[PDB]
Amino acid sequence: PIETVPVKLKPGMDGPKVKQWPLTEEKIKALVEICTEMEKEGKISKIGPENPYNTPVFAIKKKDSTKWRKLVDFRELNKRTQDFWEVQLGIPHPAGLKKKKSVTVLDVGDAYFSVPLDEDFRKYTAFTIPSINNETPGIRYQYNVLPQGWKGSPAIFQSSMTKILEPFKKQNPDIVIYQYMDDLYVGSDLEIGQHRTKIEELRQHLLRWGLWMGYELHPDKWTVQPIVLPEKDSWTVNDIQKLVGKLNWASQIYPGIKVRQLSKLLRGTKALTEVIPLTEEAELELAENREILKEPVHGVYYDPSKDLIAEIQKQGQGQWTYQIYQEPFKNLKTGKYARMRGAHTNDVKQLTEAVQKITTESIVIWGKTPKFKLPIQKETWETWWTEYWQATWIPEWEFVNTPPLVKLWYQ
Amino acid sequence: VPISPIETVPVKLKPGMDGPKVKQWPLTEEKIKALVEICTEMEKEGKISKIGPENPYNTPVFAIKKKDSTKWRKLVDFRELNKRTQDFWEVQLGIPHPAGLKKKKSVTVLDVGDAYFSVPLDEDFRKYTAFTIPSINNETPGIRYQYNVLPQGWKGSPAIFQSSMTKILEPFKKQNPDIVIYQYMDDLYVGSDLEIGQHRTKIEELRQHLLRWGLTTPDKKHQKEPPFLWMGYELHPDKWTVQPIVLPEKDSWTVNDICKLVGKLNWASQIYPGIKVRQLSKLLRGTKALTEVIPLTEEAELELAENREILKEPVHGVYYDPSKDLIAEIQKQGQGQWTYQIYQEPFKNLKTGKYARMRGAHTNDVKQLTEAVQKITTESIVIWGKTPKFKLPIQKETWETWWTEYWQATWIPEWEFVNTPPLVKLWYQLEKEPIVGAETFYVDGAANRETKLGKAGYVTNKGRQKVVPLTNTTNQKTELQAIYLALQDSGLEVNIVTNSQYALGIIQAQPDKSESELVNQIIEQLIKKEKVYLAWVPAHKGIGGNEQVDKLVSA
DNA sequence: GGTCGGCGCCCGAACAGGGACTG
DNA sequence: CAGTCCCTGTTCGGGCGCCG
């Protein structure tokens, strides 16, 4: 008996038409049981071929979770409804969330099933369940309520959500609560003990309205990975060439970098393994460049109207570096991950874990998901990435193949 | 007109476009008799109805012969309709494979007849399915009908039938959960572990459950005894194989003939292991006419004779046993060619296949092996929903060296080494640190965009030097040529300094094959060396001898 | 014959996007 | 600076094969 909020695509654009990729057995059995249940609760209903729209669907298991979770790849639908959840019903982003000692994530996707969806918009939420060896044709469904993973769901439920959070926000005014997609980020400066207690107070505060998770973050302990130069006492020709190449590349970020006096040590046609003493003018150009790399870049600041972009570099031995920017060489944040799950045995698992960690950080700091430049072949990524995904959102990505050049981000 | 017991799928046209208005083709007198005979019969059964001048639409129509029967099939040229109809999302996501079937006690196969003619069309859409039947006289106005069922030839007919068929089987499958029903269009593979007594009962129960909706299961197409003919195979209680394949024996081969040959050769490769189509596909490159006779090369005639020798022996596949693991083993057949076999017990292949796509201008066996594994993984998940364990002709240490040092992300699922030559290995390793006591070569190369001329050479720390003039070249070819020179005129251990990111990005990827002969010559020199260290320096920065050799190869 | 849909392969063409260079 | 072009990769159009 709830009134439906009318939604429309952006002008001059059709619905999404993306084919369903092949799914494993454990996934298909998980989707069948869920979909049959959601059909029995009226959340979804079967459709036919007359609907030309479709969206891929697969299943996941969150970290240290045993229950499967239905996940829809609404990236194409979200691109084609972007004007709704940014212009009319936008959500403000608290700049203090990233400054909290502890932030916790809560899957609140189950609440969106309480609000019906607009009848004219259900046609675009269509998806198909495949079968093993193509035993049966595609079993199609469509959503009859606010779908999980759609950007328009938290915008419609925002008015209802604020009223649920008001009695708790009043009792706890110093606690910051942000809502992105199917997750709820609650950050507080309290001690780890009474922090988790306040989480359970909220959890029960949402159970009484008709709604459970637990993933702790510490944004105050987030560090950046600067560009560092080696501290060698004996420098060879090869060492100085690698140093100049790195300083030359770093000059695109810090204009103050100079390699004039160091290039003077590379005048003769010398052997790479030959030891070269650093002149007085070179030892000073080296110390000055180390101080410029300590200074922050001039003129870097986040623009809300620009898309975030993230680049990832495989450094070997379980080392991965990343940089987030909107304009080239204007990096909003850098970093490095090490010893993630699958280190020293699996590179797709590490790359999948790195994207999730990076995306999570981008939501806490700016409230946006970046477009990734993944260092992997397209066919390699599209085969395994679903086997290691543990998150309810899916960022955009593209595939690059840049050979290493001068190890700029990792010694 | 009565109401059909099956629910009808609402179909619309695309907004802004009207129905088709196309004139009828001139038809042969033998086809007009076959059409009027079939038109007059379907109008008696309520499948087509007469229409008057109030229907301004029209579409062509014709008829083709049925395979191994005197009956004719009615087809409609809906090419102008299909353009303006709404788009449909097909529910057939692929084609079942016998390797995915499980051993069942009893098996039954049936095929309903005139499938599309037992499912109704949307009422509000029948007006746009208007066509004319030309009489034996050109002056006769002709009889005009409109379809009441799914017209054979319309783009929505297969989509609508598969979805309507699944809806009728759901109540049976919901009551009979332990019955496996493989539904592909009108054909139903039915199997169960129930005793043969209660099997035939559920069969009859389906044949009556399907009868309640106007779907007839004739006993002519009923199959109760093995072998079963299902999807072009021969299903036996313990093994399966494809229906016999016939290759053309043309004395004069045209482009189309090779295409029919290749296409068949592929179809077989799914159970016949060792089929190669490398030299036969080399005949289809750079050719323009589909009927251009083409002579067979010596390498293509040999490849064809081998394939004919593999098709003589009988081969068969087995069924999937969920209790035992899935295994897939790959071999290195030709340069750029790979084959594989998927099995659970040794020599009892579930299916075979081949992978031969050349991805990129520069590659190695390790890349192609990774591409092959990925193709098998996807195919396996399609058929069995799981990733097989892999037996790969690459040493464990060989692969560990590669993926750990490669800059891209790369990974292979659970696998084990199999000692089956030729083994995939890395033909050379670039050192990570400069070599002590090795001559150091500072190389560079440049060219002119207009004259197409350039120089390429090197300067070493021992005073050695060379510059070579090059004709009809580019900046990239010269920088590569300069590295080729340094490799030629050096010892077994050599340090090389360049400023070419293009050249360095290719060599570091450790390729063993390339489309460019200059790269292949560089590869051949890299294999002969014991230790090679490559390094990059920015150009035009007065670095070492890289500025001295930049000024020698400037023009 | 010159219908439709699904999937697979093989090829060239069109289009794409980055790097080094000179107007 | 902005325009090329040299190279490399991807996407697509069009031929069979197969199935119904």
Three-state DSSP class for residue B300:
helix
Which whole-number Å values give the CA distances from A410 to A219, A229, A320, A331, B162, in the listed order? 23, 10, 9, 16, 56
- Whether chain B has a CB inside 8 Å of the CB on A48: the answer is yes
Shared-domain flag, residues A280 and A312: no
Cβ-count burial B473-501 (b if 16+ within 10 Å, e if not) = bbebbbbbbbbbbbbebbeebbbbbbbbe
Phi/psi for B293 (5° steps) reads: -55, 145
Which whole-number Å values give the CA distances from A140 to A83, A149, A402, in the listed order? 28, 18, 41
Shared-domain flag, residues A157 and A200: no
Q: Which of B12, B184, B371 sits opposite A379 (nearest CB)?
A: B371
- Whether A1 is in a domain gets the answer no
Going by their DSSP bridges, the two strands A330-338 and A319-327 should be labelled as: antiparallel
Given A302, A330, A354, which residue is the final one in a domain?
Answer: A302
Shared-domain flag, residues A212 and A297: no
What the block records as the tokens of A158 is 């925002």
Task: Please report the DSSP string for B98-143 in residue order.
Answer: GGGPPP-SEEEEEE-SSGGGGSBPPGGGGGG-EEEE--SSTTS--E
Shared-domain flag, residues A365 and A274: no
Number of domains observed in the structure of chain A? 4
SS (H, E, C) chain A: CCCCCCCCCCCCCCCCECCCCCCCHHHHHHHHHHHHHHHHCCCEEECCCCCCCEECEEEECCCCCCCCEEEECCHHHHHCCCCHHHHHCCCCCCCCHHHCCEEEEEECHHHHHHCECCHHHHHHCCEEECCHHHCCCCEEEEECECCCCCCHHHHHCHHHHHHHHHHHHHHCCCCEEEEECCEEEEEECCCHHHHHHHHHHHHHHHHCCCCCCCEEECHHHCCCCCCCCCCCCCCEHHHHHHHHHHHHHHCCCCCCCCCHHHHHCCCCCCCCCCECCCCHHHHHHHHHHHHHCCCCCCCCCCCCCCCCEEEEEEEECCEEEEEEEEECCEEEEEEEEECCCCCCCCHHHHHHHHHHHHHHHHHHHCCCCCEEEECECHHHHHHHHHHCCCCCCCCCEEECCCCCCCCCCCC
Q: What is the resolution of this structure in A?
A: 3.2
Cβ-count burial A349-384 (b if 16+ within 10 Å, e if not) = bbbbbbbbbbbbbbbbbbbbbbebbbbbbeebbebb
Shared-domain flag, residues A87 and A198: no
Given A277, A302, A327, which residue is the final one in a domain?
Answer: A302
Shared-domain flag, residues A194 and A276: no
Q: How far apart are the first and last CA of chain B?
A: 88
- Whether A146 is in a domain gets the answer yes
Phi/psi for A17 (5° steps) reads: -135, 75
Beta bridge partners of B242: B233
Domain limits for position A388: 303-411
Shared-domain flag, residues A52 and A193: no
Given A180, A201, A216, which residue is the final one in a domain?
Answer: A216
Shared-domain flag, residues A111 and A133: no
Three-state DSSP class for residue B154:
coil
- Whether A43 is in a domain gets the answer yes
Number of neighbours of residue B308 by Cβ within 10 angstroms: 11
Report the footprint of strand C: residues with C-beta closer than 7 angstroms: A 19, 402; B 25, 62, 64, 75-79, 82, 90, 92-95, 152-155, 157-159, 185, 262-263, 266, 277, 281-282, 284-286, 356-358, 375, 446, 449, 475, 500-502, 539
Domain boundaries, chain B: 1-91+117-157, 92-116+158-226, 227-320, 321-427, 428-555
Shared-domain flag, residues A338 and A380: yes
Chain A stretch 169-198, residues whose beta carbon is closer than 8 A to a beta carbon of chain B: none
Shared-domain flag, residues A394 and A335: yes
Beta bridge partners of A141: A46, A127
What is the separation of C-alpha B360 from the centre of its chain, rounded to a whole number of angstroms? 19
Three-state DSSP class for residue B377:
helix
Residue with CA nearest C5 C1'? Answer: B158
Task: Please report the DSSP string for B341-352 in residue order.
Answer: EEEEETTEEEEE
Chain B stretch 89-148, residues whose beta carbon is closer than 8 A to a beta carbon of chain A: 89-97, 99-101
Chain A stretch 319-378, residues whose beta carbon is closer than 8 A to a beta carbon of chain B: 346-351, 374-377
Shared-domain flag, residues A346 and A411: yes
Shared-domain flag, residues A309 and A261: no
